[PDB]
């Protein structure tokens, strides 16, 4: 019901499907494909289109020569000769800088925490159309389902400011506090918790070793499930301290949720954390209203 649907308001963007063209690279041994993202006069193509290792990539890309062998990358639209490899992205100018309408850019995407949209071009079985999906993002990590090929999908905040491009994922994550090297309350998490990962147009990506993330592969380590700080505090206060009596900060909020003392006192959602720990399993497997715990720490109690 509406009681459990965040029902987030996202600003309608007038964007053509050509803002997110499907690019395909086909060889004798492989087919690879993703979406380019046409942003303010330039198309952005994630380089792993040409391979997922340095040697393989450099050979197929061939200093931009490889671009001549990509479908849906016509010289008529893009100035191929002026292609530039910037970090993990291939940037090519539009021949006509005005051919695709420009969009708003978020000034610090990896700092954003909250609702997002994912835009992806799709072919509808009778045209290629732009498709939108709603979800949540925490510092470049989101919860919108993707499949291989969805790289290049464009992620926006609710005001229509571009956050970045979808680029990676995982079936599961390891939970721990990497800052302290300690396990936390989420380490024993029994269900698979997949990751969905974004990269910005300035090659910012919330992973260790961002410079060549696309050529390497490690385990993905989370400190906690995807969460908003205010929403998490509201949720915990409701479960453990219904009258919200002022209770002191429990330092395990930092290790378990990466919530600081400053944030705790700032928001004024007071928590009996001992109560949360002693009823952890019940609180994380039973609903608040009809809302899951994981939904609640993202979106709030929606009351």
């Amino acid at each position: 019901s509406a009681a459990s649907n965040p029902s987030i308001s996202h600003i309608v963007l007038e964007m053509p499907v050509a803002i997110n063209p499907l690019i395909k690279y086909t060889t004798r041994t492989s087919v690879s494909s993703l979406r380019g993202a046409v942003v303010n006069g330039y198309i952005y193509i994630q380089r792993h289109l040409f391979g997922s290792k340095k040697q393989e990539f450099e050979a197929c890309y061939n200093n931009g020569k490889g671009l001549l062998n990509c479908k849906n990358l016509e010289r008529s639209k893009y100035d191929i000769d002026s292609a530039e490899l910037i970090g993990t992205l291939i940037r090519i100018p539009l021949h006509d800088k005005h051919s695709i309408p420009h969009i708003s850019i978020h000034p610090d995407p990896l700092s954003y925490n909250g609702p997002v949209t994912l835009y992806l071009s799709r072919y509808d079985t009778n045209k290629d159309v732009l498709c939108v999906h709603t979800g949540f993002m925490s510092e470049g990590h989101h919860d919108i389902k993707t499949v291989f090929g969805d790289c290049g999908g464009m992620l926006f905040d609710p005001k229509g400011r571009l956050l970045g491009l979808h680029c990676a994922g995982s079936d599961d994550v390891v939970f721990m506090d990497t800052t302290t090297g300690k396990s936390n309350i989420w380490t024993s998490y029994k269900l698979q918790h997949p990751s969905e990962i974004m990269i910005t147009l300035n090659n910012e990506i919330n992973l260790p070793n961002p410079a060549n993330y696309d050529f390497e592969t490690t385990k993905v380590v989370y400190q906690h499930p995807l969460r908003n700080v205010c929403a998490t505090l509201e949720t915990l206060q409701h479960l453990t301290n219904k009258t919200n009596a002022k209770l002191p900060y429990d330092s395990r909020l930092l290790s378990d949720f990466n919530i600081t003392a400053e944030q705790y006192n700032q928001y004024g959602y007071y928590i009996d954390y001992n109560n949360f720990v002693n009823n952890f399993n019940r609180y994380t497997t039973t609903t608040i209203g009809t809302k899951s715990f994981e939904t609640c720490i993202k979106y709030g109690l929606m009351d």
């Binding site: 090929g149 990676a168 994922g169 993905v220």
Partner: peptide, 4 residues
Amino acid sequence: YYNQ
């Protein structure tokens, strides 16, 4: 850890 995989590219999409």
